[PDB]
């Protein structure tokens, strides 16, 4: 059961190094015109599906809050 503790230690120690190794932010055109592998590595998912998911979850939350008044 010592694998989990080592995983926790390394997780914490590299979480204290958070934002030091994160990729820089770029626009859509800058990301598109990269090498073939770098474009896929550095491209975030999108903004539209994230907005749809947030809207669905928020609608559920507001509905359940309004129903328990």
């Amino acid at each position: 059961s010592e694998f989990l503790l080592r995983y926790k230690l390394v997780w914490s120690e590299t979480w204290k190094i958070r934002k030091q190794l994160d990729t820089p932010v770029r626009e859509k055109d800058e990301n598109e015109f990269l090498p073939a592998h770098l474009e896929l590595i550095e491209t975030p998912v999108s903004r539209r599906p994230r907005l749809v998911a947030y809207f669905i979850m928020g609608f559920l939350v507001i509905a359940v809050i309004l129903s328990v008044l």
Binding site: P35, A36, H37, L40
Partner: protein, 700 residues
């Protein structure tokens, strides 16, 4: 001797079918010591005969149809021709004496061992006029009709169980709850337990039995396909690639799977959906209509989604195959990558390929997710509509709660078969494409041989007479009027320039080339009347680029007959000079040769090929450029061992270099297809303006 061959050809004589005794000896008498029972039956089956060994007594021989073969366990057989009861005599055809003779009751009782072979012949209209279609598989599939009937019956019972279970749930919900039973509940629980355990057992049994039958069908089809593939002539493989033929051969399992595990499922699903629709319409026509109206949504969605998803999977598979090929070719050639400094270029290529493959995989998974979500959305919409209508019906009437629950179970169950049918519609087209692809292999002529003179063993007498040859009917003549005679034990040598035609004599000795005019003969016998498989095994041919199998050295040398002795392999290796590095190796003769070029050098592989050619006793050796692309050590050792290699053999040494035929008995010099000069070495070199001297000066 070969009573099995003589008996089989006599029985083919009686029934008027074509027999090829040396072809039978080749295919079914590989090692020797006669045929044997199983191989004799196989040969008779190959001759389109109906044979079977049966248990008959002395009195039952009066009701069988003669002639019949009495298979003695200890060798010498005999053919029973006529049984007589008016005189109590058994007229047989003795095989050792090669003439019929009459026996008595006691003699036959002593000779009869209780086993006889019944033989019959029927008609056939197949031939080779049938174009390749699904008819190539039907004879091997109908063979298991009892098994298929059993599987169909088991499937029927399983689906009646699946139909029955919702009725049990209905009875529970409509009689055990409203009226406090405690007695019907126990009976229904026992019935449900029995139904589920028997359904599980029957499903397992059906899967087991169908798997066994399909496995046997796969074995038969694959073996017969491989036989046909090997039977094809070399001209077929001269044009086609290697991966193409391998892919076409591997494209058999899809057709088999469609024929076995998709047609039966479809014919079950159609009837079973009909039954389920009848039951649901009995329960409630309104919800049955909702379900029926959803049926085209499922069909259209499946038909629309299937082709694009299939294209995405094909693209992803091709990209993965190319990436794996690049990886395996880059890891096996690391020495040349590191010797140069082309690592950045290879990394760039790998990055591009990996990005493309990963993008293809992401597209595949996105499309699959979209299709699954669409199917589930249709299902959920139907469920909502049915919930509303069923609640209204239960509130009003004409439907109790248990009826609604049972209808819900049946409606949930029936969804899959219509999707399966919508898919098999296009699966049929895909299997048609696979069939027309495999027709490239299984529709080509098998290149067989009908009538041969059945020659005796070869000793090395070769003679050409008026040989004229062209590659094509329009191509220029390569050999004009070649006339050449070689005696036994003669070590001949042939030289010349490019396009001299000396490179076609090797394929003229063996029957790969058919002369336009004249005819090649060995021992006075025209090769047009001799079985090539009897000739190819008696001629040892060594080329400059030999291919050896990836089994072992001891197997590569003993490819002709693996059940042979071992010491002969050592003798052959010593004759070819290959014993040294084999002995030096770790495992010795059991060393694995590797996949393509692992371990053994080119000269070492050539020496292995020479030893394999010399492992038998070929009276005719042909060295077609065998010492052309060899390094100095291998060429030196081969030329040193040549004097003992050509002992008791007729060796033809074809070589562009004139220094390799210095010690040849005769030096045939060819020009544009004509023997312009011949004789010994010094006699030919003596003349100053002769072509032999000119070529010798030109080369050195």
């Amino acid at each position: 001797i070969d009573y099995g061959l003589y008996a089989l050809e006599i029985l083919a004589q009686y029934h008027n079918v074509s027999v090829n005794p040396e072809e039978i000896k080749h295919r079914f008498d590989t090692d020797g010591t006669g045929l044997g029972l199983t191989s004799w039956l196989l040969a008779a089956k190959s001759l389109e005969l109906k044979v079977k060994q049966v248990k008959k007594t002395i009195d039952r021989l009066n009701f069988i149809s003669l002639p019949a073969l009495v298979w003695r366990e200890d060798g010498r057989h005999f053919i029973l021709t006529k049984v007589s009861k008016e005189a109590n005599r058994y007229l047989i055809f003795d095989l050792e004496q090669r003439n019929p003779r009459v026996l008595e009751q006691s003699e036959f009782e002593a000779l009869y061992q209780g086993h006889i072979i019944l033989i019959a012949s029927r008609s056939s209209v197949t031939g080779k006029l049938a174009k390749f279609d699904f008819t190539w598989f039907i004879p091997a599939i109908i063979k298991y009709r009892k098994i298929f009937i059993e599987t169909l019956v088991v499937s029927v019972f399983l689906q009646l169980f699946a139909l029955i279970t919702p009725l049990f749930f209905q009875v529970v919900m409509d009689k055990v709850l409203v009226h406090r039973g405690f007695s019907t509940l126990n009976v229904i629980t026992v019935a449900l337990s029995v139904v589920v355990v028997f359904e599980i057992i029957l499903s397992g049994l059906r899967t087991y039995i169908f798997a066994h039958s399909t496995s046997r069908i796969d074995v038969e089809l694959g073996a017969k396909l491989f036989r046909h593939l090997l039977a094809l002539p070399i001209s077929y493989f001269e044009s086609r690639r290697v991966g193409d033929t391998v892919a076409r051969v591997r494209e058999l399992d899809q057709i088999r799977n469609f024929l076995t595990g998709q047609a039966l499922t479809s014919v079950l699903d159609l009837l079973f959906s009909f039954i389920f629709f009848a039951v649901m319409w009995y329960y409630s026509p309104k919800l049955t209509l909702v379900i029926l109206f959803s049926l085209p949504c499922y069909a259209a969605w499946s038909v629309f989604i299937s082709p694009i998803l299939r294209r995405r999977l094909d693209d992803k598979f091709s990209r993965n195959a190319d990436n794996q090929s690049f990886l395996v070719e880059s890891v096996t050639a690391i020495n040349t990558i590191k010797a140069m400094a082309v690592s950045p270029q290879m990394t760039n290529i790998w990055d591009k390929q990996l990005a493309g493959y990963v993008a293809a995989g992401f597209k595949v998974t996105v499309l699959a997710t979209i299709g699954q979500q669409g199917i589930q959305l249709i299902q959920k919409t139907v469920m909502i509509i049915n919930l509303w209508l069923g609640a209204h019906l239960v509130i009003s009437g004409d439907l109790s709660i248990g009826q609604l629950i049972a209808f819900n179970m049946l409606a949930g169950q029936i969804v899959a078969p219509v999707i399966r049918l919508a898919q098999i519609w296009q699966d049929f087209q895909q299997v048609g494409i696979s069939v027309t692809r495999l027709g490239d292999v299984l529709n080509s002529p098998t290149e067989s041989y009908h009538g041969k003179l059945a020659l005796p063993e070869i000793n090395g007498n070769i003679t050409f007479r008026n040989i004229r040859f062209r590659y094509k009917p329009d191509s220029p003549v390569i050999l004009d009027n070649i006339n050449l005679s070689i005696k036994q034990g003669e070590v001949i040598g042939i030289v010349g320039r490019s396009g001299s035609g000396k490179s076609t004599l090797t394929k003229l000795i063996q029957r790969f080339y058919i002369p336009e005019n004249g005819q090649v003969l060995i021992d006075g016998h025209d090769l047009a009347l001799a079985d090539p498989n009897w000739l190819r095994r008696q001629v040892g041919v060594v080329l400059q680029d030999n291919v050896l199998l990836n089994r072992s050295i001891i197997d590569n040398i003993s490819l002709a007959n693996p059940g042979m002795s071992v010491e002969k392999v050592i003798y052959a290796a010593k004759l070819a000079g290959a014993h040294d590095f084999i002995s030096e190796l770790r495992e010795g003769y059991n060393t694995i040769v590797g996949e393509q070029g692992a371990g053994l050098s080119g000269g070492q592989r050539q020496r292995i090929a020479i030893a394999r050619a010399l492992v038998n006793n070929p009276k005719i050796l042909i060295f077609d450029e065998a010492t052309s692309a060899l390094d100095y050590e291998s060429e030196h050792i081969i030329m040193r061992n040549m004097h003992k290699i050509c002992k008791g053999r007729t060796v033809i040494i074809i070589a562009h270099r004139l220094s390799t035929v210095k010690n040849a008995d005769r030096i045939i010099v060819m020009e544009k297809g004509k023997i312009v000069e011949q004789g010994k070495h010094k006699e030919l070199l003596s003349e100053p303006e002769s072509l032999y001297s000119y070529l010798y000066q030109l080369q050195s």
